[PDB]
RNA sequence: AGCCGGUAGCGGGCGUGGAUCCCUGGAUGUCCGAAUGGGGGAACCCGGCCGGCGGGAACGCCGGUCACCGCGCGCGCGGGGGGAACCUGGGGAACUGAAACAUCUCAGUACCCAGAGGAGAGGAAAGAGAAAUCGACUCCCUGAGUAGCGGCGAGCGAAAGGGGACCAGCCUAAACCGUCCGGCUUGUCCGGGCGGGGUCGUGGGGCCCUCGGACCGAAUCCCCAGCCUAGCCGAAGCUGUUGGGAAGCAGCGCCAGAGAGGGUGAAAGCCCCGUAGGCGAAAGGUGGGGGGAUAGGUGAGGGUACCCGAGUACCCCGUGGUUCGUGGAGCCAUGGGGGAAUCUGGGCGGACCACCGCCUAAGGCUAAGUACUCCGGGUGACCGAUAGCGCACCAGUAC
RNA sequence: GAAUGCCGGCAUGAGUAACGAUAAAGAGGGUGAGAAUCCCUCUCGCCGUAAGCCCAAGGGUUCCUACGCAAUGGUCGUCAGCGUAGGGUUAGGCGGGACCUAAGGUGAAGCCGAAAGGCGUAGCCGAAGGGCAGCCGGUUAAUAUUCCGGCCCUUCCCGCAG
RNA sequence: AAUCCGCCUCCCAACAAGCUCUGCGUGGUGGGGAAGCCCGGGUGACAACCCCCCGAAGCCAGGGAGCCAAGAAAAGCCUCUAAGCACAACCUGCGGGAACCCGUACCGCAAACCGACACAGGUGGGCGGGUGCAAGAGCACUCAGGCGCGCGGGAGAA
């Protein structure tokens, strides 16, 4: 019915694995269909561009490449630690993501 | 060659069994079957034309149920049949079956 | 169209009479043609407006059918 | 609901169709099932003119392909309407 | 919390004032198709009637309606066509086997047709058949390759009984009574409706006396639980190191009603999707379970001999079914001819007769246990792109 | 490892046969990366009861224009019935339908058949037959009895007069 | 049913005329218009547009004669009347309005149709000029128009 994403634009996440493991950054975009996230200044690649109106002088540009969403862990705005997410039901009675280490909302 | 309108008798399939030889009960060696082939047995259908409520009604009926047509006419005397077409009259007669 | 504008469109529509809905649909189908004509000569950069009007017309006719259905 | 604007789809954009404006002949893409009598009314109520003559012809869609996939463009129908002496359709006068 | 299908792009938009997306219901739904106003070479063409639109009468468009057949007092209801197998009925081969072939086999199979439905058929003894017996029907095991059948060749092949699955029994016809209708040959008349009554084999029922005046309960209807059609919560890991990458190796931990499994840059219980264990429906479907209505259900003797399904039983002729191929050939079915009786009547127990028993024909219905797999799911000492479906891919396509 | 096995791949024959009518070519100029093969001009030959023109079948965009040349074209290709794209088919009078009937087909009534179905006067359907009102010229890259021009005509509706 | 048609009789008429319909000619009017040399178009050009001859298998046509094998139907059309209706209706003239659907490109004896091919095969109807040869749709050449057949260049054996 829908792809389960434990992370969203643009909370702050730890990149827990890969060349950029340990890195922290905001989530620029989420791409459920590839089950992937874009994280700021993480997974940078050199992309060739043609001499064009968009890119006069041409050459290369830098791009953030998607990250498999499982490689990424949200950082708790409360206790400032990387955490798994839990669901909590409010009085509202809406449901929210909350940190597993402490109990703070992640939104 | 068809169906009895009264009884619903219809053609049936039967074998025609050709036999040679002397039956055992007559001291013979026994009966031998020299051929079996399908054929049909027909009801003995005939036309019965009958006057009912001033209109001519005809039934196609196996001879066995010829007297049945008359029973229907007799029982028909309690029916409002005047003015009706032969088809409707027939339908009414058959209803009484 | 914005969700809020859709909500409002249906509210106002449901207050209109069958006769007013017909007149309105007629005018919106006229505007649709005008949009088609513009898109045809490459003078409609806001091409999303075509789909929008089409769905408005559908919403209008849906309510028209609502009114007449009882 | 059926309106004149369901009948008249688009103007025909071509050097042949433009050549007609001079003598008051305007050429439209119309709904393929639309009648000459129907188109006359539709053009008249849409553009406020008087239609004196209507010519129609069906235009078969061209067969086309993207790589392996053979297909057809939709069939169309076009109408040439003659407006009354001195009248004009400014929408098409355009150009 | 993203989104405007596969699908990026151009050019433009939408979403926490809850979008995209998923489920349910509704709306719209050109034309053809049973196709049904009529015609037709399917997807086109041409009309009647009513109402509307345009200047509109000619012309055209929009809405409504108009086929035929069956049943029921012009109008109502129903029918038509489709569905992978499965089912029942009406018809029904041949190769082949018999080491030739004709009876026989294949086989009541393949196939054609009609019909049915989520099943269908069958079903409440005119049964079985030897037990002083059993007790509707269906289905599985068995009985049993027995009994038998058979150019007594090739081959074919039961049933009772026993063990199980399921379990359920009802409605009529006739006697007699009431009423309405019509026939004409006037009544204690005959006939056709409808209602009451009645439903059985220890025979039952009717009628007439005579004694006696609440419990059962649906297979129908109502409510409900439960289920299906979307979903939701869900424990516990960090560091170093090699490496493009760790989940490998090392150190120190932790969860476990969860160590099924799939992912993540390599080999991860603790990163992700999940798993164990739990949670969930406003709407529609289902509801065989629970609750409740309703229909229906019910004595005893005594006398009377009124009734107890007709072109039927029964006999003969022709044939089918059964294990039974004419055989001593019954039973069940019936195309032809003849042709009864109402319980002191009738059918059966393998010619026939006697005795002794069994059973109640010629009206109808009836869940469940059984079959199948288009569809959804689960699982393989199943396949892994010449395999596995003909198709992993835009295939019943190209050709 | 064999089944003239099956599917696929690739060899041999072999730079071989052949390149599809013996109507036939030559030169100059142009285009272009490239020219016997495309365009233009001159010369030559071939058809001319056709190898020319028009119509009906059938085919279905092959038409016109621009841009192309990997494949298709029996060579070549700058060309093309090929690739991409845009354009192009205009009717009261032409053809068919809103008219008729032919064989035949269907089929009220009706008849027959195990089922499916077979027939069947009328009616209906059925044409390249009957019937019915447009000729000449001009115009487009591409349609023309259709657009335009001139001169004619038909039916239906309504009205007026007789 | 009929005043129509058929049959009988009488009276005028009759290779006549008349009435009607078609073909061809003319006809207000609208068009077209060559070679040639000029870059499909301009000019030629104010183009001319006349006479004679030949002449259809086509037209008048539903013509004529002969023959035996004896040669569709139905509608349109006309006439007759029936219900009806005779303020209607139909007929003639005139006027205004109205006049829908589908086809129309292109190939079409062929490289676009049937033959697996741009295939020496097959494909129904019409036009098919001129000169000469007795005629002709034959034959030879040639007009208009269309082509040289989608591998070539050499060589000069069997
Ligand atoms: Mg979720
Ligand atoms: Mg890691
Ligand atoms: Mg680190
Ligand atoms: Mg919520
Ligand atoms: Mg016999
Ligand atoms: Mg004997
Ligand atoms: Mg003896
Ligand atoms: Mg024998
Ligand atoms: Mg007879
Ligand atoms: Mg008789
Ligand atoms: Mg008999
Ligand atoms: Mg008899
Ligand atoms: Mg919406
Ligand atoms: Mg609509
Ligand atoms: Mg032009
Ligand atoms: Mg209109
Ligand atoms: Mg047209
Ligand atoms: Mg398309
Ligand atoms: Mg898209
Ligand atoms: Mg963009
Ligand atoms: Mg909500
Ligand atoms: Mg829906
Ligand atoms: Mg439509
Ligand atoms: Mg339809
Ligand atoms: Mg129809
Ligand atoms: Mg029909
Ligand atoms: Mg009307
Ligand atoms: Mg108007
Ligand atoms: Mg009108
Ligand atoms: Mg209509
Ligand atoms: Mg209609
Ligand atoms: Mg049927
Ligand atoms: Mg059915
Ligand atoms: Mg059977
Ligand atoms: Mg049957
Ligand atoms: Mg049979
Ligand atoms: Mg069968
Ligand atoms: Mg046979
Ligand atoms: Mg045999
Ligand atoms: Mg065999
Ligand atoms: Mg065998
Ligand atoms: Mg054998
Ligand atoms: Mg044999
Ligand atoms: Mg043998
Ligand atoms: Mg033999
Ligand atoms: Mg045999
Ligand atoms: Mg058999
Ligand atoms: Mg089978
Ligand atoms: Mg069926
Ligand atoms: Mg079941
Ligand atoms: Mg049943
Ligand atoms: Mg019983
Ligand atoms: Mg034993
Ligand atoms: Mg057998
Ligand atoms: Mg048993
Ligand atoms: Mg048992
Ligand atoms: Mg069980
Ligand atoms: Mg029981
Ligand atoms: Mg009476
Ligand atoms: Mg009686
Ligand atoms: Mg009585
Ligand atoms: Mg009575
Ligand atoms: Mg008794
Ligand atoms: Mg019951
Ligand atoms: Mg979870
Ligand atoms: Mg977890
Ligand atoms: Mg490595
Ligand atoms: Mg490293
Ligand atoms: Mg690590
Ligand atoms: Mg470890
Ligand atoms: Mg487990
Ligand atoms: Mg595992
Ligand atoms: Mg795993
Ligand atoms: Mg491991
Ligand atoms: Mg492993
Ligand atoms: Mg794992
Ligand atoms: Mg569970
Ligand atoms: Mg669960
Ligand atoms: Mg009782
Ligand atoms: Mg008693
Ligand atoms: Mg008695
Ligand atoms: Mg009985
Ligand atoms: Mg009876
Ligand atoms: Mg017998
Ligand atoms: Mg037998
Ligand atoms: Mg027998
Ligand atoms: Mg014997
Ligand atoms: Mg026997
Ligand atoms: Mg006996
Ligand atoms: Mg018998
Ligand atoms: Mg009999
Ligand atoms: Mg007895
Ligand atoms: Mg007796
Ligand atoms: Mg008996
Ligand atoms: Mg007997
Ligand atoms: Mg017995
Ligand atoms: Mg005995
Ligand atoms: Mg006895
Ligand atoms: Mg018994
Ligand atoms: Mg039954
Ligand atoms: Mg039950
Ligand atoms: Mg059942
Ligand atoms: Mg069952
Ligand atoms: Mg099953
Ligand atoms: Mg499955
Ligand atoms: Mg394997
Ligand atoms: Mg595997
Ligand atoms: Mg493969
Ligand atoms: Mg395969
Ligand atoms: Mg492989
Ligand atoms: Mg396969
Ligand atoms: Mg599949
Ligand atoms: Mg395959
Ligand atoms: Mg395949
Ligand atoms: Mg394919
Ligand atoms: Mg070997
Ligand atoms: Mg070989
Ligand atoms: Mg070989
Ligand atoms: Mg060999
Ligand atoms: Mg081989
Ligand atoms: Mg091999
Ligand atoms: Mg092979
Ligand atoms: Mg090979
Ligand atoms: Mg080699
Ligand atoms: Mg080779
Ligand atoms: Mg060589
Ligand atoms: Mg050689
Ligand atoms: Mg050689
Ligand atoms: Mg050679
Ligand atoms: Mg040759
Ligand atoms: Mg050659
Ligand atoms: Mg040159
Ligand atoms: Mg040159
Ligand atoms: Mg060249
Ligand atoms: Mg070249
Ligand atoms: Mg050239
Ligand atoms: Mg020549
Ligand atoms: Mg000549
Ligand atoms: Mg054509
Ligand atoms: Mg073709
Ligand atoms: Mg093409
Ligand atoms: Mg063209
Ligand atoms: Mg083209
Ligand atoms: Mg061309
Ligand atoms: Mg070019
Ligand atoms: Mg090429
Ligand atoms: Mg090339
Ligand atoms: Mg090339
Ligand atoms: Mg290319
Ligand atoms: Mg090639
Ligand atoms: Mg080539
Ligand atoms: Mg070739
Ligand atoms: Mg070039
Ligand atoms: Mg070409
Ligand atoms: Mg092209
Ligand atoms: Mg163009
Ligand atoms: Mg015209
Ligand atoms: Mg016509
Ligand atoms: Mg009409
Ligand atoms: Mg017609
Ligand atoms: Mg007709
Ligand atoms: Mg009939
Ligand atoms: Mg027929
Ligand atoms: Mg006929
Ligand atoms: Mg007709
Ligand atoms: Mg016709
Ligand atoms: Mg015709
Ligand atoms: Mg004709
Ligand atoms: Mg005509
Ligand atoms: Mg004319
Ligand atoms: Mg042309
Ligand atoms: Mg053109
Ligand atoms: Mg004109
Ligand atoms: Mg008058
Ligand atoms: Mg008379
Ligand atoms: Mg007279
Ligand atoms: Mg007269
Ligand atoms: Mg003239
Ligand atoms: Mg004249
Ligand atoms: Mg002049
Ligand atoms: Mg000139
Ligand atoms: Mg000139
Ligand atoms: Mg001049
Ligand atoms: Mg001059
Ligand atoms: Mg002069
Ligand atoms: Mg001649
Ligand atoms: Mg003559
Ligand atoms: Mg003769
Ligand atoms: Mg006729
Ligand atoms: Mg007629
Ligand atoms: Mg009168
Ligand atoms: Mg008159
Ligand atoms: Mg007029
Ligand atoms: Mg029409
Ligand atoms: Mg058209
Ligand atoms: Mg054309
Ligand atoms: Mg043409
Ligand atoms: Mg042409
Ligand atoms: Mg050609
Ligand atoms: Mg041509
Ligand atoms: Mg030829
Ligand atoms: Mg020809
Ligand atoms: Mg040609
Ligand atoms: Mg071809
Ligand atoms: Mg060809
Ligand atoms: Mg060639
Ligand atoms: Mg050829
Ligand atoms: Mg020929
Ligand atoms: Mg000529
Ligand atoms: Mg001559
Ligand atoms: Mg000569
Ligand atoms: Mg000569
Ligand atoms: Mg000549
Ligand atoms: Mg000759
Ligand atoms: Mg010649
Ligand atoms: Mg010659
Ligand atoms: Mg000449
Ligand atoms: Mg020439
Ligand atoms: Mg040549
Ligand atoms: Mg050649
Ligand atoms: Mg050449
Ligand atoms: Mg040489
Ligand atoms: Zn926290």
Curated annotation (Swiss-Prot), chain A:
One of its GO terms (biological process) is translation. Disulfide bonds: none annotated. SMART domains: KOW. GO terms for cellular component: ribonucleoprotein complex; ribosome. The keyword ATP-binding does not apply. Keywords: Ribonucleoprotein, Ribosomal protein, RNA-binding, rRNA-binding. CDD domains: KOW_RPL26 (cd06089). Transmembrane segments: none annotated. GO terms for molecular function: rRNA binding; structural constituent of ribosome. PROSITE patterns: RIBOSOMAL_L24. Part of the 50S ribosomal subunit. NCBIfam families: rplX_bact. HAMAP family: Ribosomal_uL24_B. Belongs to the universal ribosomal protein uL24 family. PANTHER family: MITOCHONDRIAL RIBOSOMAL PROTEIN L24 (PTHR12903). One of two assembly initiator proteins, it binds directly to the 5'-end of the 23S rRNA, where it nucleates assembly of the 50S subunit. One of the proteins that surrounds the polypeptide exit tunnel on the outside of the subunit. This is Large ribosomal subunit protein uL24. It comes from Thermus thermophilus (strain ATCC 27634 / DSM 579 / HB8). The gene is rplX.
Curated annotation (Swiss-Prot), chain B:
InterPro entries: Bacterial_rp_bL28, Ribosomal_bL28, Ribosomal_bL28/bL31-like_sf, Ribosomal_bL28_bact-type. It holds the Pfam family Ribosomal_L28. Keywords: Ribonucleoprotein, Ribosomal protein. One of its GO terms (cellular component) is ribonucleoprotein complex. It comes from the Bacteria. The keyword Ribosomal protein applies. GO terms for biological process: translation. GO terms for molecular function: structural constituent of ribosome. Part of the 50S ribosomal subunit. Belongs to the bacterial ribosomal protein bL28 family. This is Large ribosomal subunit protein bL28. The gene is rpmB.
Swiss-Prot record, chain C:
This is Large ribosomal subunit protein uL29. Belongs to the universal ribosomal protein uL29 family. One of the proteins that surrounds the polypeptide exit tunnel on the outside of the subunit. It comes from the Bacteria. Keywords: Ribonucleoprotein, Ribosomal protein. InterPro entries: Ribosomal_protein_uL29, Ribosomal_uL29, Ribosomal_uL29_CS, Ribosomal_uL29_sf. Part of the 50S ribosomal subunit. It comes from Thermus thermophilus (strain ATCC 27634 / DSM 579 / HB8). GO terms for cellular component: cytosolic large ribosomal subunit. The gene is rpmC. One of its GO terms (biological process) is translation. GO terms for molecular function: structural constituent of ribosome.
Curated annotation (Swiss-Prot), chain D:
The keyword Nucleotidyltransferase does not apply. It comes from the Bacteria. GO terms for molecular function: rRNA binding; structural constituent of ribosome. GO terms for biological process: translation. SUPFAM superfamilies: Ribosomal proteins S24e, L23 and L15e. Keywords: Ribonucleoprotein, Ribosomal protein, RNA-binding, rRNA-binding. One of its GO terms (cellular component) is ribonucleoprotein complex. Contacts protein L29, and trigger factor when it is bound to the ribosome. Part of the 50S ribosomal subunit. HAMAP family: Ribosomal_uL23_B (MF_01369_B). Belongs to the universal ribosomal protein uL23 family. PANTHER family: 60S RIBOSOMAL PROTEIN L23A (PTHR11620). One of the early assembly proteins it binds 23S rRNA. One of the proteins that surrounds the polypeptide exit tunnel on the outside of the ribosome. Forms the main docking site for trigger factor binding to the ribosome. This is Large ribosomal subunit protein uL23. It comes from Thermus thermophilus (strain ATCC 27634 / DSM 579 / HB8).
């Amino acid at each position: 019915m829908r792809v389960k994403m434990h992370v969203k634009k643009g909370d702050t996440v730890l990149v827990a694995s890969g060349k950029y493991k340990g890195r922290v950054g905001k989530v620029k975009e989420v791409l459920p269909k590839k089950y992937a996230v874009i994280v700021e200044g993480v997974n940078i690649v050199k992309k060739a561009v043609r001499v064009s109106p968009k890119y006069p002088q041409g050459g290369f540009i830098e791009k953030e490449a998607p990250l498999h969403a499982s490689k990424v862990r949200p950082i708790c705005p409360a206790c400032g630690k990387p955490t798994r997410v839990r669901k909590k039901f409010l009085e509202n009675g809406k449901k929210i993501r909350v940190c597993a280490k402490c109990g703070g909302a992640l939104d | 060659s068809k169906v009895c309108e009264i009884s619903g008798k219809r053609p049936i399939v039967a074998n025609s069994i050709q036999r040679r030889g002397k039956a055992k009960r007559e001291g013979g060696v026994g009966k031998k079957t020299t051929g079996i082939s399908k054929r049909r047995q027909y009801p003995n259908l005939q036309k019965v034309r009958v006057r009912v409520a001033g209109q001519e009604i005809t039934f196609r009926v196996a001879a066995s149920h010829i007297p049945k047509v008359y029973e229907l006419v007799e029982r028909a005397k309690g029916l409002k049949l005047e003015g009706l077409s032969p088809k409707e009259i027939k339908k009414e007669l058959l209803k009484l079956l | 169209m914005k969700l809020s504008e859709v909500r409002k469109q249906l509210e106002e529509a449901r207050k209109l009479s069958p006769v007013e809905l017909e007149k309105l649909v007629r005018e919106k189908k006229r505007e649709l043609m005008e949009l088609r004509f513009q898109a045809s000569i490459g003078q409609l950069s806001q091409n999303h407006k075509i789909r929008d009007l089409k769905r408005q017309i559908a919403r209008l006719l849906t309510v028209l059918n609502e009114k007449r259905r009882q | 609901m059926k309106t004149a604007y369901d009948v008249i789809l688009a103007p025909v954009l071509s050097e042949k169709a433009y050549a007609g404006f001079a003598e008051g002949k305007y050429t439209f893409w119309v709904h393929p099932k639309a009648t000459k009598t129907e188109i006359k009314n539709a053009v008249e109520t849409a553009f406020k003119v008087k239609v004196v003559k209507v010519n129609t012809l069906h235009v078969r869609g061209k067969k086309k392909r993207l790589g392996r996939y053979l297909g057809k463009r939709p069939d169309r129908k076009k109408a040439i309407v003659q407006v009354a002496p001195g009248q004009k359709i400014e929408a098409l006068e355009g150009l």
